Paper text:
The large ribosomal RNA precursor (pre-rRNA) is transcribed by Pol I, accounting for up to 60% of total cellular RNA synthesis in Saccharomyces cerevisiae. Yeast Pol I transcription initiation is regulated by four general transcription factors: the regulatory factor Rrn3, the Core Factor, the TATA-box Binding Protein (TBP), and the Upstream Activation Factor (UAF). In addition to recruiting Pol I/Rrn3 to the ribosomal DNA (rDNA) promoter, Core Factor has also been implicated in transcription bubble opening.
State 1 shows a striking feature that the upstream DNA and Core Factor are rotated more toward the back of Pol I, projecting the DNA away from the active site. Thus, State 1 with a slightly open cleft should correspond to the step right after the loading of the promoter DNA, whereas State 3 adopts a more closed cleft resembling the elongation mode. State 1 likely represents a step immediately after promoter DNA insertion.
Author numbering:
A (entry chain B): 1090 to 1143, 1146 to 1196
B (entry chain G): 8 to 170, 214 to 251
C (entry chain D): 12 to 49, 80 to 100
D (entry chain A): 1029 to 1109, 1112 to 1200, 1214 to 1273
E (entry chain B): 460 to 516
F (entry chain A): 1 to 141, 172 to 268, 312 to 444, 450 to 686
G (entry chain F): 72 to 154
H (entry chain B): 803 to 974
Write the structure that this text describes.
RNA sequence: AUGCGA
């Protein structure tokens, strides 16, 4: 309660398919489409997407750079301290990763 | 190697069923019953109506609503099953037990239910009562529930306008009531869902 | 309307869906709606009744 | 990481077992103070009998299994009351029964102290108002079970503070450097390595001093008086 | 430069004047109390370098 | 924390593992190429360190998430490093494994069958079958290839038996077997393994003469010449600098030729992931870009000071762009220019530039590996001394906290603490409103934020906050008649309003002194607001547990925000649960000085 | 993991830590409108209310005692000897 | 307790040019209640009661076309003791852009404030005892300060005992 | 030497089983000691 | 960082 819940308690995005809280992003909404949680690792390039060897329909979401991705819709939110997120910040420089385990898979 | 992973894309992105046209004259059996497992929260306020809790909380708002996971609008639920938090329970107890989170009075539970979902696919033949006729579409309503529209571009030019005017069929008589069409697309990225129909295939 | 307190974390099927017949669909619909009459979902239930009516023959 | 397992074994937060019992008794220090003051407990017997009345609980446990092991083991142990290949026919009662579940599974040291008190007070037991070493001993056993350390106690930390905190008040290395030399660094090269030698009862004090001279090292320098180099 | 040195105590020279530290040479007069103000000029330091030592002799 | 926002996806474990440049490129929110940071004295450089893909700024949404700085979690870009750097952290590793190979066969010096012995032992150590790991030693027999294959056969058979046994006994699992002693047996094994790796001073499997490997220290390895005795020995078998790239291309091939053992060589536990062991793990083909959000300049109220990451990273962009320019020189160069040794100097640009940039990446990694009080890198980050993990993780600042000079008081309980009304009006409890507390919380609102057992703010079940800091008694009066309102949204129908009531005479607070020397120094006290106080009031009996004295001693007061922690403060931390020390069980708390002498005077038989 | 009830081997008594958490969690639930099975008798602090519920063992909670193996014993309030 | 403030505006200097702030007003849109503390020149009336949040001066920057103020940031109210105008060391600066303002913050004896005798026996005042509740001598007086005797036996502050008996003699 | 232990962990491909109380605080998890040494469930009516 | 309550 003291060192967490009453200090820096943050509900942060994590990729249920990646196990990281820094690939997460809000997918861009539209006048008829909301912003959806996507994991960058968990998405396919709409310019590729097996297009040479290959759609569900509603798995393409757009980046603030207006780029469409297919997939990435498998990330959820979990409670941690925000400094934890600060760790990935350094880690990506550090060349490592969290495989943040969780529920049903 | 990079084709094992493409096997992962195709085998993960495969589709289960192709709901057929009933008698091949009706509509596709896009309505299906599928037994599932959901993970829902239970508030303390439903401690005396826990299956009804799950209903009012999660199951009641889901009916008549699209589920991305199931691929459709939840048509109804059958056979709810709470996963007991404790083995050797013969499977029945005038009261159940559930794991409570280690932080809040809130509970989390497993539930098992069969869902009746309308799972339409591209190519399904549907009939609708003409809702509207604008020079780019004809609105229809499937079962009095699903909005359907066939845009002018998806209609054969051999169709005929009569002046929102009044479209006349390819035979040379104006269209009326119900229409049979093939589904080109279903748009569910908006507030609800709109099914894109075609009269040219 | 965005979180858990209303929406399940995860939902997965344990079998491949089963193509309920029109008659099985109708029996489910009537039993479910009938059990439901005993909250804006009621309006969708009215639409389900319209589906029922459409699954009855005529709107 | 070091805490009390639910089985009374001391495991780390890993799960690796550290001790099979806390001090081998699972007793709370914050309970012990009167756990060995039998006479006092007796002068206020009826009050504690009013606190820990067992009739509420005598339905939840066994009052014999540990007591029975106590009878065969206390008998054979009094028969074997040399440490070595000693009579193994009986591990302590704490080995054979969760001391929290069958009243009477208690250290033989505590058991012994209690019985010896009860024997040395048979005249108090001819002085007692009407208590007996079985009803009074039963009550004190219940104090012992009810004095046990709760499952999950952070006893590792408790240890750490009980060694650190009092170390602030602080021929051979003493005090903080000695404590650091052991606990902190475990240095295999002590600053003041000593070996204590017991000398036989038959060994005279003069023979012993002779031996003390006879073993000590003697450097060549140590005998030199004068060196003249021409 | 002598304002800087006198405001920082950041003694730098090509010889270091043979002195054990390169800071602390300058102090706040702290005129907060006549006792403290006069006391400043009767303070003498053994030097910081002996302050860093762990011993106490 | 809020109970009104549960989660049910808790993390159950943490895996560690190397990133991959392909992973970064695919996940990467952007490639940053522009060493520029700002433009027009005030604008975010396009595709530079302060591109909006690295988060929101200036009402510009994170160009990777379109979210504001107050909403956008921010997103991490990446740099496609022109040259593959050595990982400092594995520089000792990559050096060791470099000396352990054979350079003419590209196999390891040590006996192939001996290696196979290592694979077997390390497989047994994923499952921690230590006694069996030693039981492998029993497998015993110029040695024929059929015979060395017979040892590999018998050893693999031993793996099969130890496996069948371990799965039969459930004495391990697919996920391995891990314990402190097992971990130790692995570290020990890896040690003897490294000694065998170091033992070969010429190749054995291939007999080839590997060069002696030298290093600059942190940026170059050179490949030493051999001796004509060793060179002519090379005939019978018939310091130079080498790039990181060549090391990578060779060592990859070694990782293919020795992968079979290396699968368990590179894991302390079973590799469920079928991970290829790649040499690119010690080299950096690309560099990520953290969000500026955590790379923001130190601006404190007005002053904006440049980030040390921005500066060293700018050094990466400058040096890298120079090397890109050298590749421009090769482009300018290389039509043919048959005899223009003019590249010999540009070749000084390649060797010097390349080692220089590589070194600069090193320095950006660890300040203690470059060549003055330089800006700290990530290693002189959360570690070393106090840092983040120690100074902001294992201990933190906290809200709902106070600090004050403590004052004695015999009239309060010995288990309570007299809090001056500044704290009584400045400490709140997140009170869920009920049918049973509607009266008390409606009253607290009536008082308003500026009164007794009052409440400063009210958070609806909708999630929104309404501060009473400046609301008039009338409007707060309106909410008092609105404190019990019905549900409004099925999204919110399960919640109830909250009232942030002031701390009051029924709340417990955790008082902690300065000498946290032991748990007895931080106990739970029952809060008693004392009127017309400004100082923390404490009973004398506690001062010997805090080792406190009114000389000027200060104490911290914690107000817990959670019923589980409240229950702890009523049951665990309470003064009575600390009647004795656990060190000795000499009780601790008692009266002192004046009270003791008072007992001596009152207790005289002469006192009537 | 299910320790058979007939096979449950743990301490019949509620630990101080057990007691504390039980009262805290149950109180918090009451504070979230868990149905009170006893007279509020004037009380307004959910913690003291949960204290009353412990006094009557009306609490419908179970403690899952873990062993470092991971097997556990689910015990009701209504049985573990409170004191 | 006196706290001194330096309000400098020449920190951004750099070629007169755009220098623009003058203590005073321009937009009128400011709360005219700022006159409740600050004279129409932007400086508080010497003697003014100020509480944290109150404006400590008022000025006008043409870039903002606004009358802006530097707020007072403290835990307690004060009074403006001195306002000092500094044009000094300047080349011209005639607009008086640097002002030093001295605040007088009163410090009442209060519970928790430390007090000490000439003996290094320091202690905080735990409470301000009502005079009636004090003990009164047959001399008709009740002490100013009461120190507990049990403090002396560890400290061996017997110089304090003699200081008491000598100061009493020397007053009588 | 946090980074040295980090190196030894990654080079191992180590997995934290998240038992250490220190580690558990680092990851924002209910401490496994004492009151976090166990779980609490609720008996709920099934009808 | 220094000084400080200590
Ligand atoms: Zn992912
Ligand atoms: Zn962003
Ligand atoms: Zn070789």
């Amino acid at each position: 309660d003291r060192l967490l819940n009453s200090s820096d308690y943050t509900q942060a995005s994590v990729c249920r398919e990646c196990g990281s809280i820094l690939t997460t992003q809000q997918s861009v909404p539209r006048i008829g489409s909301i912003s959806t949680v996507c994991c960058r690792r968990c998405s396919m390039r709409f310019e590729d997407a097996k297009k040479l060897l290959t759609e569900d329909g509603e798995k393409i979401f757009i980046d603030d750079s207006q780029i469409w991705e297919d997939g990435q819709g498998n990330k959820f939110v979990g409670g941690n301290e925000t400094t934890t997120v600060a760790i990935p910040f350094v880690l990506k420089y550090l060349d490592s990763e969290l495989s943040a385990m969780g529920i049903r898979l | 190697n990079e084709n094992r992973e493409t096997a992962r894309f195709i085998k993960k992105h495969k589709k289960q069923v192709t709901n057929p046209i009933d008698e091949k004259n009706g509509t596709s059996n896009c309505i299906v019953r599928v037994p599932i497992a959901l993970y829902v929260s239970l508030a303390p306020m439903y401690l005396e109506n826990p299956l009804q809790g799950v209903m009012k909380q999660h199951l009641n708002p889901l009916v008549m609503k699209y589920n991305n996971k199931v691929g459709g609008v939840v048509l109804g639920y059958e056979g709810l099953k709470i996963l007991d938090a404790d083995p050797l329970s013969k499977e029945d107890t005038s009261e159940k037990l559930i794991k409570i989170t280690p932080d809040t009075p809130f509970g989390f539970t497993w539930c098992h239910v069969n869902l009746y979902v309308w799972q339409p696919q591209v190519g399904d033949v549907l009939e609708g009562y003409i809702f509207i006729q604008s020079a780019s579409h004809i609105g229809l309503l499937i079962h009095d529930a699903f909005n359907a529209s066939i845009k002018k571009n998806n209609i054969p030019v051999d169709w005929t306008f009569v002046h929102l005017g009044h479209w006349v069929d390819s035979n040379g008589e104006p269209i009326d009531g119900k229409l049979r069409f093939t589904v080109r697309n279903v748009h569910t990225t908006g507030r609800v869902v709109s099914v894109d129909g075609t009269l040219i295939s | 309307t965005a979180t858990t307190l209303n929406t399940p974390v995860v939902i997965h099927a344990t079998q491949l869906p089963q193509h309920v017949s029109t008659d099985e669909v109708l029996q489910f619909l009537e039993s479910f709606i009938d059990e439901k009459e005993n909250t804006n979902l009621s309006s969708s239930i009215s639409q389900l009744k319209r589906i029922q009516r459409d699954f009855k023959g005529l709107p | 990481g070091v805490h009390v397992s639910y089985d009374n074994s001391i495991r780390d937060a890993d799960g690796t077992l550290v001790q099979f019992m806390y001090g081998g008794d699972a007793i709370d220090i914050t309970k012990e103070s009167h756990m060995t003051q039998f006479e006092f407990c007796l002068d206020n017997y009826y009050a504690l009998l009013k606190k820990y009345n067992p009739s509420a609980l005598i339905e939840h446990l066994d009052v014999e299994s540990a007591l029975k092991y106590s009878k065969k083991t206390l008998k054979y142990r009094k028969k074997h009351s040399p440490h070595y290949k000693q009579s193994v026919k009986y591990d302590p009662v704490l080995a054979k029964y969760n001391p929290a579940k069958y009243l009477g599974s208690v250290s033989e040291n505590f058991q012994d102290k209690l019985e010896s008190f009860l024997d040395k007070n048979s005249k108090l037991f001819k002085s007692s108002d009407g208590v007996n070493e079985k009803k009074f001993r039963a009550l004190m056993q219940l104090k012992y079970m009810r004095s046990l350390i709760n499952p999950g106690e952070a006893v590792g930390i408790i240890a750490s503070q009980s060694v650190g905190e009092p170390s602030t008040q602080m021929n051979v290395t003493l005090g903080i450097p000695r404590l650091r030399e052991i606990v902190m660094t475990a240095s295999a090269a002590i600053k003041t390595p000593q070996m204590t030698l017991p000398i036989w009862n038959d060994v005279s004090d003069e023979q012993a001093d002779t031996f003390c001279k006879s073993i000590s090292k003697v450097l060549l320098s140590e005998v030199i008086d004068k060196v003249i180099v021409t | 430069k002598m304002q800087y040195f006198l405001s920082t105590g950041n003694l730098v020279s090509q010889s270091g004047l043979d002195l054990q530290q390169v800071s602390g040479y300058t102090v706040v007069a702290e005129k907060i109390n006549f006792y403290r103000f006069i006391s400043h000029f009767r303070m003498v330091h053994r030097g910081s370098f002996f302050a860093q030592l762990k011993t106490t002799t | 924390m809020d109970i009104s926002k549960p989660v049910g996806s808790e993390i159950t474990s943490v895996d560690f593992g190397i990133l991959t440049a392909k992973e970064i490129r695919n996940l990467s929110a952007k490639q940053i190429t522009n060493p520029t940071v700002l433009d027009n004295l005030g604008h975010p450089v396009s595709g530079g360190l302060y591109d909006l893909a690295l988060g929101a700024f200036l009402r510009n949404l994170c160009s990777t998430c379109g979210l504001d700085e107050k909403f956008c979690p921010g997103h991490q870009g990446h740099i496609e490093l022109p040259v593959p750097c050595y990982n400092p952290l594995f520089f000792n590793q990559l050096y060791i494994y470099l000396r352990a190979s054979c350079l003419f066969c590209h196999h390891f010096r040590l006996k192939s069958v001996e290696v196979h012995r290592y694979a077997c032992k390390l497989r047994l150590l994923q499952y921690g079958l230590i006694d069996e790991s030693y039981k492998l030693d029993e497998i015993t027999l110029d040695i024929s290839s059929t015979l060395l294959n017979e040892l590999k056969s018998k050893r693999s058979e031993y793996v099969d038996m130890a496996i069948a046994k371990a799965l039969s006994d459930g004495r391990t699992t697919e996920r391995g077997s891990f314990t402190a002693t097992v971990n130790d047996e692995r570290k020990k094994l890896v040690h003897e393994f490294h000694k065998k790796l170091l033992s070969r001073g010429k190749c054995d499997n291939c007999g080839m003469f590997s060069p002696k490997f030298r290093k600059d220290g942190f940026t170059k390895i050179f490949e030493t010449a051999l001796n004509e005795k060793q060179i002519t020995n090379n005939r019978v078998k018939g310091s130079t600098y080498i790039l990181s790239t060549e090391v990578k291309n060779i060592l990859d091939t070694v990782f293919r030729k020795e992968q079979c053992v290396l699968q368990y060589v590179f894991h302390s536990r079973p590799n469920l992931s079928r991970k290829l062991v790649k040499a690119d793990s010690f080299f950096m083909d690309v560099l990520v870009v953290p969000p500026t959000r955590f790379r923001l300049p130190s601006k404190l109220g007005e002053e904006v000071h440049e980030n040390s990451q921005n500066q060293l990273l700018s050094k990466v962009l400058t040096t890298s762009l120079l090397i890109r320019d050298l590749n421009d020189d090769l482009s300018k160069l290389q039509k043919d220019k048959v005899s223009l040794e003019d590249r010999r100097v540009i070749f000084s640009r390649l060797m010097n530039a390349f080692v220089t940039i590589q070194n600069d990446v090193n320095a950006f990694i660890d300040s203690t590996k470059a060549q003055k009080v330089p800006i700290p890198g990530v290693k002189q980050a959360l570690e070393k001394k106090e840092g983040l993990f120690r100074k902001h993780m294992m201990g933190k600042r906290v809200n709902y906290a106070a600090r004050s000079v403590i004052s004695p008081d015999p009239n309060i309980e010995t288990n309570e603490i007299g809090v001056p009304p500044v704290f009584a009006v400045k400490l709140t409890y997140p009170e869920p409103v009920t049918a049973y507390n509607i009266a008390e919380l409606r009253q607290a609102v009536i008082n308003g934020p500026d009164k007794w057992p009052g409440a400063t703010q009210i958070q609806n079940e909708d999630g929104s906050l309404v501060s009473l800091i400046g609301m008039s008694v009338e409007q707060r009066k309106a909410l008092a008649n609105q404190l019990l309102t019905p549900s409004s949204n099925v999204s919110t129908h399960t919640l109830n309003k909250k009232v942030y009531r002031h701390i009051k005479n029924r709340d417990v607070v955790l008082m902690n002194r300065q000498p946290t020397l032991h748990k007895a120094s931080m106990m739970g006290h029952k809060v008693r607001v004392l009127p017309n106080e400004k100082t923390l009031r404490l009973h004398y009996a506690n001062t010997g547990a805090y080792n406190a004295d009114f000389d000027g001693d200060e104490m911290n007061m914690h107000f817990p925000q959670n019923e589980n922690a409240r229950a702890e403060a009523l049951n665990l931390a309470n003064t009575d649960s600390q009647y004795l020390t656990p060190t000795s069980g000499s009780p601790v708390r008692g009266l002192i000085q004046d009270h003791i002498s008072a007992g001596v005077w009152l207790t005289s038989k002469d006192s009537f | 993991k299910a320790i058979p009830k007939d096979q449950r081997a743990t301490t019949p008594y509620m630990t101080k830590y057990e007691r504390a958490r039980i009262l805290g969690t149950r109180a918090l639930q009451i504070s979230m409108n868990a149905p009170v099975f006893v007279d509020l008798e004037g009380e307004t602090d959910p913690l003291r209310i949960a204290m009353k519920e412990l006094a009557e063992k009306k609490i419908p909670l179970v403690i899952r005692r873990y062993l470092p193996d991971g097997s556990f014993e689910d015990w009701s309030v209504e049985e573990l000897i409170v004191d | 307790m006196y706290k001194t403030e330096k309000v400098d505006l020449a920190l951004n200097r750099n070629r007169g040019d755009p220098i623009t702030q003058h203590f005073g007003f321009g937009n009128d849109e400011w709360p005219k209640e700022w006159l409740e503390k600050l004279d129409e020149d932007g400086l508080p009336y010497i003697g003014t009661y100020v509480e944290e949040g109150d404006p400590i001066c008022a000025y006008f920057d043409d870039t903002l076309n606004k009358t802006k103020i530097k707020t007072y940031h403290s835990s307690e109210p004060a009074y403006i003791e001195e306002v000092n105008l500094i044009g000094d060391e300047s080349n011209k600066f005639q607009e008086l852009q640097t002002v030093s303002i001295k605040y007088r913050i009163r410090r009442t004896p209060q519970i928790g404030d430390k007090f000490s005798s000439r003996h290094g026996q320091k202690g905080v005042c735990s409470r301000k005892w009502p005079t009636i509740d004090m003990p009164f001598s047959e001399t008709g007086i009740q002490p100013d300060i009461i120190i507990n005797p049990h403090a002396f036996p560890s400290r061996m502050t017997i110089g304090m005992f003699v200081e008491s008996l000598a100061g009493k003699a020397g007053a009588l | 030497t946090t980074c040295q232990f980090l190196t030894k962990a990654v080079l191992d491909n180590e997995r934290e089983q998240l038992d250490s109380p220190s580690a558990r605080i680092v990851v924002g998890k209910l401490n496994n000691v004492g009151t976090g040494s166990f779980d609490v469930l609720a008996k709920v009516p099934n009808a």
